[PDB]
Design a protein around this ligand. Sequence first.
Ligand SMILES: Nc1ncnc2c1ncn2[C@@H]1O[C@H](COP(=O)(O)OP(=O)(O)O)[C@@H](O)[C@H]1O
Ligand SMILES: Nc1ncnc2c1ncn2[C@@H]1O[C@H](COP(=O)(O)OP(=O)(O)O)[C@@H](O)[C@H]1O
Ligand SMILES: [Mg+2]
Ligand SMILES: [Mg+2]
Lengths: 512, 512, 170
Amino acid sequence: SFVEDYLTKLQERPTIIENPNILKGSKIFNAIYRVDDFVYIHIQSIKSEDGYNQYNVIEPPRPTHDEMEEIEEKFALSIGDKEPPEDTKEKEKLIRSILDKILLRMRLSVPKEYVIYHFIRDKLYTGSLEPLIRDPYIEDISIPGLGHVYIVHKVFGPMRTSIKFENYEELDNLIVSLSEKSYRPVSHNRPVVDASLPDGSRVNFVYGVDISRRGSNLTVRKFSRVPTSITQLIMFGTLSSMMAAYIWTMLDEGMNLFVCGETASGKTTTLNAITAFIPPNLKIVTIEDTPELTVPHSNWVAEVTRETGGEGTIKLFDLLKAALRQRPNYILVGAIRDKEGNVAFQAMQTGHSVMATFHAANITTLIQRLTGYPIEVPKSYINNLNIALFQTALYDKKGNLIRRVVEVDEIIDIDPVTNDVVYIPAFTYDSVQDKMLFAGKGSSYLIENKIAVKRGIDRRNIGLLYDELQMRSRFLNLLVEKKIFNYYDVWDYILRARQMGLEEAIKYVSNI
Amino acid sequence: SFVEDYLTKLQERPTIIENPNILKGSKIFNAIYRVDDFVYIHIQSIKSEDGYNQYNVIEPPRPTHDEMEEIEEKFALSIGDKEPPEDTKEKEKLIRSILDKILLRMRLSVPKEYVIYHFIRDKLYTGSLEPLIRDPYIEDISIPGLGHVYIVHKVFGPMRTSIKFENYEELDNLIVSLSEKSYRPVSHNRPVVDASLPDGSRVNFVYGVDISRRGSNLTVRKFSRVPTSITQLIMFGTLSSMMAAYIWTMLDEGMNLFVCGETASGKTTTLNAITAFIPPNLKIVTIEDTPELTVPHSNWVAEVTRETGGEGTIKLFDLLKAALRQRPNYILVGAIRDKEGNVAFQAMQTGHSVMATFHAANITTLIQRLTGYPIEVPKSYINNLNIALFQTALYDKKGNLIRRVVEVDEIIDIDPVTNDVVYIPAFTYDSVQDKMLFAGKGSSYLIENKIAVKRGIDRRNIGLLYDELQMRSRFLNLLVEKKIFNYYDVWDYILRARQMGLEEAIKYVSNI
Amino acid sequence: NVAFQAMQTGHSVMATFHAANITTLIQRLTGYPIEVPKSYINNLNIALFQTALYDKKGNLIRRVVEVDEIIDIDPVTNDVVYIPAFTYDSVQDKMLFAGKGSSYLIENKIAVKRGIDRRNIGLLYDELQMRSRFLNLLVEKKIFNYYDVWDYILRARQMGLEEAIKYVSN
Ligand SMILES: Nc1ncnc2c1ncn2[C@@H]1O[C@H](COP(=O)(O)OP(=O)(O)O)[C@@H](O)[C@H]1O
Ligand SMILES: Nc1ncnc2c1ncn2[C@@H]1O[C@H](COP(=O)(O)OP(=O)(O)O)[C@@H](O)[C@H]1O
Ligand SMILES: [Mg+2]
Ligand SMILES: [Mg+2]
């Protein structure tokens, strides 16, 4: 068969899996896995001098150019007047039929099925890129110009694929047909185009050698349908169970919270994980430039921006303004860096809860950038933001990149005398022991001065809040210990905890 | 009956109740309350796993799809060239008649009265959302995308209803159809629309999967056709009786006044309330992007902008220019933001009084924005605007949201040494004691340089003006004490005060 | 302005800019039409300055005259704080590592990422010295072609510095 045909020509035969997660940290490998019928992936860890491992795409052989052009011809002549009907799925299963009854009397080189696959892949889908689209372990796809297609793999990082573009014309035809298929055709007049693929991936096209001098280029950004969960983050060591419990307590009470950090620090991942702590019967509105977030709540409005060059442009600013008319309980802003930040604080000021990510290493930098142009949050408004957490990518002792929350700050106010932010570090990070340090039971301005007054608690009864905090930490630990990691499983158990109560939920989980 | 039918399919029967107010606090129940003769609501005390109570709409059964198609097509074939009348009642009268003719000769799968309910519901009203609109216990309605319609119920809080939208295009059609019925169609170019349903409920639309990625979404917020009155605003603490008396005095004398603040600070609400102070026999032209102002005056031109995506588009600017030829006494502009601001001041310079809402937190910012791009009011004309009030949202000590007019400024001049506004703060606010402060006696330039001169009172009998002011404050305080809060009742009492004098008015209303 | 937007969204950036020194650079970055607000200026970490100078025979040479690390904003003056990591001694025609042992980017960015205490910073300066040693060896062996040099840098990435140094030394 086509796989074994490939698989026999290899000097050293690759093993079998179907999930390269096992290889995490394995710097040596030679494996092959399924994607679809007609698509297998052979990953081999060569000692490539420029540090790319190999990602080999295994597809059915192609009929000769002559066969195709003959099949194209005979096909084009059919359904002439006839219009290609709307629906994608039952009107794909039509092009099939027509293929059969023009192939059934043809002497073909390769087996028909394999002819079918290539005809369909190129006509109805993303052609040679389709295996990469179909592969759930790929996050970025780049065709920078002439040469190989490059990807970023979640396990392996950047890899070089076996797919190769040798001429400008192939490249052009790819960018043109895909952009047309995405209903946003490129032209020489407007050669730069952003669009969505049917699977929801985002694609950027740049068309014409006069603009992309190594040949027309594209970039596909794919998004995970299943976000990393809060128990995974705890297991990774990125947050402690107590820290996550603290966040849970705060989101349960509608606190406003920014997840901050600099390049690739994991802000969006942490944001998506802690979203599971927002009470499940509430309305969440997400507003993003890029559709990265997946919210488990049923009452979830998900909005994205649109840039048209002028008329019809919809910005984050516009969507946050509209969110004030949408009765949200939480507004989640993908990332703040412009005037939408001002509207976000006005949303906080008028009874709406907000979370967002922001690119900044520490609270001083965060406040300076929020109060500066272009965001222009007034100092008198900064107090609306209750929690700023900062995380960063660091190396561990083995040289591996890890992500860590390095500080969690409770914002109290800006000092009128000094114009400096008054805040309390709720958590800090000890890099030596690799542990999150909790400031403790007498430490939280938010618990004592905000929540206590909210939940109608007297000072004598303040320990009951710290007690529930402790119980939440216990529950999260038990989830981790029982290996409850999948985002939706974790959501289910959070919901269970809310339904039966923490004390009883802990007993239930203890006995799995 | 359609209801009794429904009950028989149930595992166990719910108790019939007059209204859900009795179920309040409780959580072990099972009830059916009546909305219309066609709408009964079944409420289930057993939560879903995500903590939503279930709100089940009991409607009469629908005709088959082919029956409905047959009816629509026949309805369309009758009358199909003629345009329907604008009057909603006459419209419905016509539709029922025509419908009665078509159905008379038909053999229906369900009773006639049921076909009629559903036809009228979908054609004239809000379709499957109509039961929610008609239930007075519904506060908010959300369709966040594909899935159920979610609501906020006055008794039960968030609930999941039995209404579902499972098809992108059907959801698009709903948003398009409802926006068209709201007199403000969405388009792909302008996919975000704020408007009001025919019943007066505010609605926000977001159109197209390219912007709302889980499907077109909407939010309905119910609330009185009766606008909040000035006596209610005093009782809320948003402004004092003296502040209202001041504004009343100023509008009596044709002063120009902007209501300023951030979004959702309550500016439109305050403008609508103080409009009741404009003398009753005057011409009012309102100019808005969507109607919010409910003017009680008889001589009221209500104009609204229009976006067509091409020819026929009419903006605030165009309407404001036309107002110069319409002999209004007051022009009320819903909000001023762009070059229409310049025309508003042209209106002032040609003898028309103007009020508007504007986005600015203080007088300094207001003047910077008026004089800068794109408004560009020349500096020497800025003092045509007499009064700016600034309103903001805040939290009190308990954490409750409140809205307060925090400053009232009289605009005197722009200082040529150099370009700073000369103004007088006639009122300010003490945020600690939550109190409004008057400047006050012999502080107002407008009282003692415009009104006194017109009157024409000497600088030593100026007490007469401040006595009329203290007088108006007492009358307003009296209305609050006697709980005269309804907008139109307050209007009547104001007109009554005009038509027998303050002294006689205070003394009257003291009795009740 | 968009280059700074790119830094603020987690993309690294390099660029050339026509300016003689950090003061001029910052005036131009913060002024019209670039208009980067001061609070974002320190997204740019390093500014290097290079000039055409005359040699003693009156021919043109190019020299890096300063390398500046951009730190943050001074709370008293509202000015951009920077420290020179390198300066140029025109009389000896030598680059001075003025930031040696006191570089902000080395201690507060690099060292922190590596979890290296303020008291073990010497390890980073050791690694730097080995990098320099390697670059000298390439020069000594007349490895000048851009692609040959690129190959050796990659060889150093692979294999590691110490034995790349051994291989080059031969
Ligand atoms: N806690 C973590 N542990 C390990 N990897 C992570 C963690 N958080 C994020 N990542 C990975 O790091 C990269 C950047 O994550 P992202 O959430 O997009 O960061 P940012 O939002 O700060 O740009 C992604 O590849 C993501 O899968
Ligand atoms: N003084 C007030 N007190 C309490 N609620 C108010 C007040 N003014 C307005 N609101 C409510 O606040 C919300 C925003 O009001 P609106 O007048 O539309 O503000 P803006 O015009 O500034 O956007 C509305 O739901 C309205 O009912
Ligand atoms: Mg308004
Ligand atoms: Mg990011």
